């Protein structure tokens with residue numbers, strides 16, 4: 325939604341451009357546009373969903 | 382959200 | 389100077405003008421081909437007359 329995608333060893337994070345601040349790649353940290361097949365340099369990953377930790381109760 | 386309300 | 393992939397720099401320069409980053413990657417080859425062709429036209433314009 326803002327900033328950039330980043331990778332660790334094998335974790336991935338999102339951060340703002342101008343100061344490193346690694347956060348989990350959640351749906352509320354991200355947004356969707358189209359299927360993958362168009363995109364140059366995309367990577368397979370898990371996007372975390374915060375709703376299911378709530379609705380499981 | 383309401384579509385997910387099956388829980 | 390911090391290194392950044394050029395296609396990601398373009399995505400920010402799009403973001404800066406109020407076009408959302410996805411519109412670049414959804415069109416990357418077309419954008420590159422326009423840009424490359426346009427630089428050809430620049431060279432031709434400067435070749436044609438002083």
Ligand SMILES: *[C@@H]1O[C@H](CO)[C@@H](O)[C@H](O)[C@H]1NC(C)=O
Nearest residue numbers: 331332333334335336337346
């Ligand atoms: C994530 O980052 C920390 C610091 O680089 C490191 O200790 C940890 O092992 C990394 N984990 C993965 C799976 O990348």
Ligand SMILES: *[C@@H]1O[C@H](CO)[C@@H](O)[C@H](O)[C@H]1NC(C)=O
Nearest residue numbers: 360361363365366367368369
């Ligand atoms: C992503 O993972 C799926 C797993 O079935 C695989 O079919 C696909 O080719 C992978 N794509 C990339 C870019 O690795």
